[PDB]
């Protein structure tokens, strides 16, 4: 299938074990795509403060669409040293190895694959 339901676990940013998925952009997008689909792939919303308490390369989830059945569609998106490799729209937030964290809250997303 071209796109997949998820419901990804939010996490606060201070709980994150593992604040990244690798080392150049090739290998955080596809580990994030693996991670996503053994469902072990945690959200981080945002904010002020966050993206320096996380590990570049980083990789968004942005939407691509203005959403089925309550999830946004959602595209893949990795960011190092200031440049972009990917094009899309607004930032849901930045993808993370989930290892057992608590979520604070969950964000149901139709993910191009």
Request: glycine share 10%; with cysteine; aromatic share 4%.
């Given at each position: 299938?071209?796109?997949?339901?998820l419901?990804?676990?939010?996490?606060?940013?201070?709980?994150?074990?593992?604040?990244?998925?690798?080392?150049?952009?090739?290998?955080?997008?596809?580990?994030?795509?693996?991670?996503?689909?053994?469902?072990?792939?945690?959200?981080?919303e945002?904010?002020?403060?966050?993206l320096?308490?996380?590990?570049?390369?980083?990789?968004?989830?942005?939407?691509?669409?203005?959403?089925?059945?309550?999830?946004?569609?959602?595209?893949?998106?990795?960011?190092?040293?200031?440049?972009?490799?990917?094009?899309?729209?607004?930032?849901?937030?930045?993808?993370?190895?989930?290892?057992?964290?608590?979520?604070?809250?969950?964000?149901?997303?139709?993910?191009?694959?």
């Amino acid at each position: 299938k071209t796109h997949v339901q998820l419901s990804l676990p939010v996490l606060q940013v201070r709980d994150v074990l593992v604040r990244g998925f690798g080392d150049s952009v090739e290998e955080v997008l596809s580990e994030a795509r693996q991670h996503l689909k053994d469902g072990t792939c945690g959200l981080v919303e945002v904010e002020k403060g966050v993206l320096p308490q996380l590990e570049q390369p980083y990789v968004f989830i942005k939407r691509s669409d203005a959403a089925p059945h309550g999830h946004v569609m959602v595209e893949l998106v990795a960011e190092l040293e200031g440049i972009q490799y990917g094009r899309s729209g607004e930032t849901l937030g930045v993808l993370v190895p989930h290892v057992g964290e608590i979520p604070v809250a969950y964000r149901k997303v139709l993910l191009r694959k």
